[PDB]
Ligand binder design. Structure first.
Ligand SMILES: CC(C)CCC[C@@H](C)[C@H]1CC[C@H]2[C@@H]3CC=C4C[C@@H](O)CC[C@]4(C)[C@H]3CC[C@]12C
Ligand SMILES: CC(C)CCC[C@@H](C)[C@H]1CC[C@H]2[C@@H]3CC=C4C[C@@H](O)CC[C@]4(C)[C@H]3CC[C@]12C
Ligand SMILES: CC(C)CCC[C@@H](C)[C@H]1CC[C@H]2[C@@H]3CC=C4C[C@@H](O)CC[C@]4(C)[C@H]3CC[C@]12C
Ligand SMILES: CCCCCCCC/C=C\CCCCCCCC(=O)OC[C@@H](O)CO
Ligand SMILES: CCCCCCCC/C=C\CCCCCCCC(=O)OC[C@H](O)CO
Ligand SMILES: CCCCCCCC/C=C\CCCCCCCC(=O)OC[C@H](O)CO
Ligand SMILES: CCCCCCCC/C=C\CCCCCCCC(=O)OC[C@H](O)CO
Ligand SMILES: CCCCCCCC/C=C\CCCCCCCC(=O)OC[C@H](O)CO
Ligand SMILES: CCCCCCCC/C=C\CCCCCCCC(=O)OC[C@H](O)CO
Ligand SMILES: CCCCCCCC/C=C\CCCCCCCC(=O)OC[C@H](O)CO
Ligand SMILES: Nc1nc(NCCc2ccc(O)cc2)nc2nc(-c3ccco3)nn12
Ligand SMILES: CCCCCCCC/C=C\CCCCCCCC(=O)O
Ligand SMILES: CCCCCCCC/C=C\CCCCCCCC(=O)O
Ligand SMILES: CCCCCCCC/C=C\CCCCCCCC(=O)O
Ligand SMILES: CCCCCCCC/C=C\CCCCCCCC(=O)O
Length: 388
C-alpha cells in the first residue's frame, strides 16, 4: 500500500483548514455578543459557551488530533489527555445545547416569570458547573477506565517507545466500552433525545397558545353575531356572560383596551338584566369599535411574538440536528467496532473522514446564526465592514 505520509498530509492539511475556520467563525460570534447589547441575553451566553468550546476545538482539539494520528511514543496518561480533551469539548457543547433548549422552553411556557427565574448570574453559574462536569465526564478515562494496564506490546517495541510509554493511538488507550456505553449512549444520545423532547414541547406550547388566541377571537365574533340576531334580553345575557369571561381570558395602548371592552360588556349586561333588549344590542355593537382600535392590535402582536419564537426555536433546533449529523457517524463506527467483533474494522480512510466530519461542526454554527438570526447577521455586517 501507499506511503503513510501522503494520506497523512491530506488529513493534516484538511484539519488545519477546519481549525482556521472554527477559530475565525466563532471569534466572530463572541465579538458580536460583546459589542451588541441586543445580543446580550441569557440565551446567547450559552451560545458564547458553545462558541468558546468550538474555538477550543480549533486551538487545541485539532492539534491534538494531528498529534495522535502519528502514533508517537508517549506516556499513557499523557496520551489519554490528548485522546480525551475533545470529549470535554463535546460534552460542554451537549450541556450548552441542552441549556438553550430548556431556556427557550421556560421562555414560552412562563414568559412573565422568565426574567425573574432566568438571570445572567444564574446562567453564568450553570456554565461554570457544566464546564467542571464536562472535564469530569470527558476525562473519566484518566481516572482509571483505560487500556494503559494492557498495553499493545508489539506496537510499543516496534517503534521503540520508552519504558512506561505506549504508541499513542486512540483505540489502544481509550476503551471502546467507555466510548459506546458511557460516552455515546449515556452522555450524548440521552441528552440529544431529551433535547428533541424539549423542542417538540416548545412547538406544542406554541401551537396550543396560537390556538387559544384563535379561539378567543372567534368566540368574540360568534357571540357578537348571537346578540345581533337575538329574540329576547335573556339570550343577550347568555352571549354577554360568555363574552365577559373570554374578555378576562385574553386579558391575562394595551390595558386601556380591555378596560373599555369589559366596561362596554358590563354596560350591555346591566341593560340586559333590566329587559332593555334593543339598548343592549346597540351597546354590544359599540364593542366593534374597541375590537378594531385595541383588541385586533393585541392579537396581531401576541401572534407574531409566538411566530418569532417558533422561528427562533427552529433555528436553534437545526444546530442540534447538525451536531447530531456531524457526530453520529463516528459514534456509529464505534458501535460497529464494539458490537460486531466478526465484522472487519472500518477502514483507515473512513475513520479519518468521520473525525474530520465531527470537527467541521465547529465551523457550522456561525453560519446558521448569520442566515437565521437577523440580529447576528446585522452585527456580523457592522463588524466586517468597519473592521477591514
Ligand atoms: C495552556 C494551553 C494553551 C497549553 C496546553 C498544554 C498542552 C499542549 C500539554 C499539557 C499536558 C501535555 C502532555 C503531558 C504528558 C505527555 C506525555 C509525554 O510522554 C509526551 C507528551 C505529553 C502527551 C504532553 C503533550 C502536551 C500536553 C497535552
Ligand atoms: C447520521 C447518518 C448520516 C450516519 C449514517 C451511518 C453511517 C456512518 C454508517 C452507514 C453504513 C455503515 C457501515 C456499514 C458496514 C461497515 C462494515 C463493517 O465491517 C465495519 C463498519 C462499516 C464500515 C459501517 C460504518 C458506519 C456506516 C458507514
Ligand atoms: C436513535 C438514533 C438516531 C441513534 C442511532 C442508534 C444506534 C445506537 C444504532 C443504529 C444502527 C445500530 C447498529 C446496526 C447494526 C449492528 C450490527 C450488529 O452486528 C451489532 C450491533 C450494530 C453495530 C448496531 C448497534 C447500534 C446502532 C449503531
Ligand atoms: C482557546 C480556548 C477558549 C477561548 C475562550 C473564548 C472566550 C470568549 C468569550 C467572549 C465573551 O466574553 O463575550 C460574551 C460576553 O460579552 C457576553 O456578555
Ligand atoms: C483550557 C481552556 C478550556 C476552554 C474552556 C473555556 C471556558 C469557556 C467559558 C466561557 O467563555 O463562557 C463564559 C460565558 O461567556 C459567560 O457569559
Ligand atoms: C498545541 C500543540 C499540540 C501539542 C502536541 C504535542 C507534541 C508531542 C511531541 C512528542 O512528545 O513527541 C515525542 C516523540 O517521542 C518523538 O520524538
Ligand atoms: C493558572 C493555571 C492555568 C491552568 C492550566 C493547568 C494545566 C492543566 C494541564 C496539565 O497540567 O495536565 C497534566 C497532564 O495531564 C499530566 O499527564
Ligand atoms: C470533579 C472533580 C474530580 C476530582 C478527581 C480527580 C482525581 C485525580 C485523578 C488523577 O490524577 O488521575 C489518576 C492517577 O494520576 C493515575 O495514575
Ligand atoms: C439511550 C439508551 C441506550 C441503552 C440501550 C441498552 C442496550 C444495551 C444492551 C447490550 O449492549 O447488549 C449486551 C451485549 O451482550 C453487548 O455485547
Ligand atoms: C436509542 C437507544 C439505542 C440502543 C442501541 C443498542 C443496540 C446495541 C446492539 C447490541 O447490543 O448488540 C449485541 C451483540 O450481540 C453484541 O455482540
Ligand atoms: N474510534 C476512534 N478512533 C480514533 N482514532 C484512531 C483511528 C484508528 C482506528 C483504528 C485503527 O486501526 C487505526 C486508526 N479517534 C476517535 N475519536 C472518536 C470519537 C470521539 C468522539 C466520539 O468518537 N473515536 N475515535
Ligand atoms: C464535510 C467533510 C469535509 C470534507 C473533507 C475532505 C476529505 C479529506 C479528509 C479525509 C480523507 C481521508 C484521508 C486519508 C486517511 C488519512 C491517512 C492517515 O492519517 O494515515
Ligand atoms: C500562541 C501561543 C504559541 C503556542 C505554540 C506552541 C508551539 C508548539 C506547537 C507544535 C510543536 C510540536 C513539535 C513536535 C515535536 C517533534 C518531536 C521530535 O522532534 O522528534
Ligand atoms: C491561534 C493560534 C494557536 C494555534 C497553535 C496550534 C498550532 C499547532 C499546529 C500543529 C500541531 C503539531 C503536531 C505535532 C505532531 C507530532 C509529530 C511527532 O512528534 O511524531
Ligand atoms: C461527507 C461526504 C460523504 C460522501 C462519501 C462518504 C462515503 C462513506 C459511506 C460508506 C463507506 C463504506 C465503506 C466500505 C466498508 C468496507 C468493508 C470492510 O470493512 O472491509
Amino acid at each position: 500500500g501507499a506511503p503513510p505520509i501522503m494520506g497523512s498530509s491530506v488529513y493534516i492539511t484538511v484539519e488545519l483548514a477546519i481549525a482556521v475556520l472554527a477559530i475565525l467563525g466563532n471569534v466572530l460570534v463572541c465579538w458580536a455578543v460583546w459589542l451588541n447589547s441586543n445580543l446580550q441575553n441569557v440565551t446567547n451566553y450559552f451560545v458564547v459557551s458553545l462558541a468558546a468550546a468550538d474555538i477550543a476545538v480549533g486551538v487545541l482539539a485539532i492539534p491534538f488530533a494531528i498529534t495522535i494520528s502519528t502514533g508517537f511514543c508517549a506516556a499513557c496518561h499523557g496520551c489519554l489527555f490528548i485522546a480525551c480533551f475533545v470529549l470535554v469539548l463535546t460534552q460542554s457543547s451537549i450541556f450548552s445545547l441542552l441549556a438553550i433548549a430548556i431556556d427557550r422552553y421556560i421562555a414560552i411556557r412562563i414568559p412573565l416569570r422568565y426574567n425573574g427565574l432566568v438571570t445572567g448570574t444564574r446562567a453564568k453559574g450553570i456554565i461554570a458547573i457544566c464546564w467542571v462536569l464536562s472535564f469530569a465526564i470527558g476525562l473519566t478515562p484518566m481516572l482509571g477506565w483505560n487500556n494503559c494496564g494492557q498495553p499493545k506490546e508489539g506496537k510499543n517495541h516496534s517503534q521503540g517507545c520508552g519504558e512506561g510509554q505506549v504508541a499513542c493511538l486512540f483505540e489502544d488507550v481509550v476503551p471502546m466500552n467507555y466510548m459506546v456505553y458511557f460516552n455515546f449512549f449515556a452522555c450524548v444520545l440521552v441528552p440529544l433525545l431529551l433535547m428533541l423532547g424539549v423542542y417538540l414541547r416548545i412547538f406544542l406550547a406554541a401551537r396550543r397558545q396560537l390556538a387559544d388566541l384563535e379561539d378567543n377571537w372567534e368566540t368574540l365574533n360568534d357571540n357578537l353575531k348571537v346578540i345581533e340576531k337575538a329574540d329576547n334580553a335573556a339570550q343577550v345575557k347568555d352571549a354577554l356572560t360568555k363574552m365577559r369571561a373570554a374578555a378576562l381570558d385574553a386579558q391575562k395602548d394595551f390595558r386601556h383596551g380591555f378596560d373599555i371592552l369589559v366596561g362596554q360588556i358590563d354596560d350591555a349586561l346591566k341593560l340586559a338584566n333590566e329587559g332593555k333588549v334593543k339598548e343592549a344590542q346597540a351597546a354590544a355593537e359599540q364593542l366593534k369599535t374597541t375590537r378594531n382600535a385595541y383588541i385586533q392590535k393585541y392579537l396581531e402582536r401576541a401572534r407574531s411574538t409566538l411566530q418569532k419564537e417558533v422561528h427562533a426555536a427552529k433555528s436553534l433546533a437545526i444546530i442540534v440536528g447538525l451536531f447530531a449529523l456531524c457526530w453520529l457517524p463516528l459514534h456509529i463506527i464505534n458501535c460497529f467496532t464494539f458490537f460486531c467483533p466478526d465484522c472487519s474494522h472500518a477502514p483507515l480512510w473512513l475513520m479519518y473522514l468521520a473525525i474530520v466530519l465531527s470537527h467541521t461542526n465547529s465551523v457550522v454554527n456561525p453560519f446558521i446564526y448569520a442566515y437565521r438570526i437577523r440580529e447576528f447577521r446585522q452585527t456580523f455586517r457592522k463588524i466586517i465592514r468597519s473592521h477591514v
